[PDB]
């Protein structure tokens, strides 16, 4: 069985109300993982559910053990760096790059929704790349929150919020900044709920169509908020060139390859 003594401490990946996430190395394999340490005190929809949700673009739960105090989840750790870091080193991504990343995300989401699982955390900080250029949706953050309108108005974490999160993520990928990046900030509540999001002119009209769709304020009208869930999104104008089987097969080539030797390469483990 796994136990605290099976790992070497590397650094803190994230702290939080729920607990913390540490970057560790399993002495037996020399392999790297992120260990989420949840206070039992503080605490279900997070345990087991993720424990089993396995998908190419979802971080995998390697081991799940518990101390008498906390709950520990050792999960695979992408070593190709964080999306935020790559994005910012380019200000924006080519629309085809957005595309490449968004589709791997759509693939994960279609999957989670097929199991009546709402992700709630689709956002740039939760995105990393693995050694090969492929996306890994993480479960934790190392930025203003852009909750979905129905979450702000009704505390309604239904399927749609994931599509809303997909839109905010690609809007930033293609524009280089959030939708209300300049407008103060304590304004976010009223802006998200009632301000129209405007799109740069430099955006292909399909891309402009996708964003306008993913960012609909009415879940009932969002691209993906319809009973067909992911399908509305997989079949959007913006998404034609795509081969979804290809997508989930990791058969697509990543438009960017992180500069790591092997998953063992610890070079992205800094800033």
Alpha-carbon span 53 to 133, nearest angstrom: 22
Q: Annotated binding residue at 13?
A: yes
Strand order in the sheet with 70-76: 7-15, 19-26, 31-39, 70-76, 61-66
Residue 18 counted as an annotated binding residue: yes
Question: From CA 216, how far away is CA 235, in angstroms rounded?
Answer: 17
CB neighbour list of residue 207: distance below 8 Å, 6 or more residues apart = 95, 98, 170, 174, 238
**Per-residue buried b or exposed e for 114-140, using 16+ beta carbons within 10 Å of the residue's own CB:** eeebbbeebbbbbbbbbbebbbbbbbb
| Burial (CB count <10 Å: 0-12, 13-18, 19+), residue 219 | buried
Going through 94-151 in order, the beta strands assigned E by DSSP cover 127-129, 135-137
3-state secondary structure of 87: helix
The Cα 155–Cα 149 span in angstroms is: 9
Task: Give the pair of three-digit tokens for residue 234.
Answer: 């997989």
Nearest alpha carbon to residue 203 among 237, 246, 162: 237
Among 143, 124, 125, 146, CA closest to 191: 146
By three-state DSSP, how is residue 83 classified?
Answer: helix
User: Looking at domain 1-81+260-269, which of 3.30.200.20, 3.30.830.10, 3.40.50.2000, 3.20.20.30 is its CATH number?
Assistant: 3.30.200.20
Are the C-beta atoms of residues 53 and 118 closer than 8 Å to each other? no
Q: How many CB atoms lie within 10 A of CB 67?
A: 11
The annotation status of 79 as a binding-site residue, yes or no, is: no
Which letter does DSSP use for residue 82 in this model? B
Does 15 appear as a known binding residue?
Answer: yes
Q: How was this structure determined?
A: X-ray
Q: Which two tokens stand for residue 271?
A: 């800033």
Quoted resolution (Å):
2.3
Tell whether residue 126 is among the known ligand binding residues. yes
**Residues 6 or more apart whose Cβ sits within 8 Å of residue 117:** 49, 53
Catalytic residues: 121
**Cα–Cα distance, 172 to 186 (Å, whole number):** 20
Range list of H helices, 15-90 = 49-52, 83-88
The domain spans of the chain are: 1-81+260-269, 82-259
* Alpha carbons 106 and 57: distance in angstroms, whole number: 10
For 71, the token pair is 């709950």
* Interior/surface letters 193-204, b for 16+ CB within 10 angstroms, e for the rest: eeeebebeeebe
What are the strands, taking DSSP E only, across the chain? 7-15, 19-26, 31-39, 61-66, 70-76, 127-129, 135-137
**CATH code linked to domain 82-259:** 1.10.510.10
């Amino acid at each position: 069985k796994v136990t605290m003594n099976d790992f070497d401490y590397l650094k803190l990946l994230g702290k939080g109300t729920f607990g913390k996430v540490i970057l560790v190395r399993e002495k037996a394999t020399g392999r790297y993982y992120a260990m989420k340490i949840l206070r039992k005190e503080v605490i279900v929809t997070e345990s087991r559910v993720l424990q089993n949700t396995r998908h190419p673009f979802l971080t995998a739960l390697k081991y799940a053990f518990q101390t008498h105090d906390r709950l520990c989840f050792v999960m695979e750790y992408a070593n190709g760096g964080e999306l935020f870091f790559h994005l910012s080193r380019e200000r924006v991504f080519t629309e085809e790059r957005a595309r490449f990343y968004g589709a791997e995300i759509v693939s994960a989401l279609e999957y989670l929704h097929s199991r009546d699982v709402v992700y709630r955390d689709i956002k740039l900080e939760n995105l990393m790349l693995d050694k090969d250029g492929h996306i890994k949706i993480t479960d934790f953050g190392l930025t203003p929150e852009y909750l979905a309108p129905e979450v702000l108005e009704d505390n309604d974490y239904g399927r749609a919020v994931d599509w809303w999160g997909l839109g905010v993520v690609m809007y930033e990928m293609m524009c280089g900044r959030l939708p209300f990046y300049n407008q103060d900030h304590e304004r976010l509540f009223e802006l998200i709920l009632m301000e129209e999001i405007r799109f740069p002119r430099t955006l292909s009209p399909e891309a402009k169509s996708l964003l306008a769709g993913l960012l609909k304020k009415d879940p009932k009208q969002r691209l993906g908020g319809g009973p067909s869930d992911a399908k509305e999104v997989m079949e959007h104008r913006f998404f034609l060139s795509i081969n979804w089987q290809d997508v989930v097969q990791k058969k697509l080539l990543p438009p960017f390859k992180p500069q790591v030797t092997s998953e063992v390469d610890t070079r992205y483990f800094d800033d």
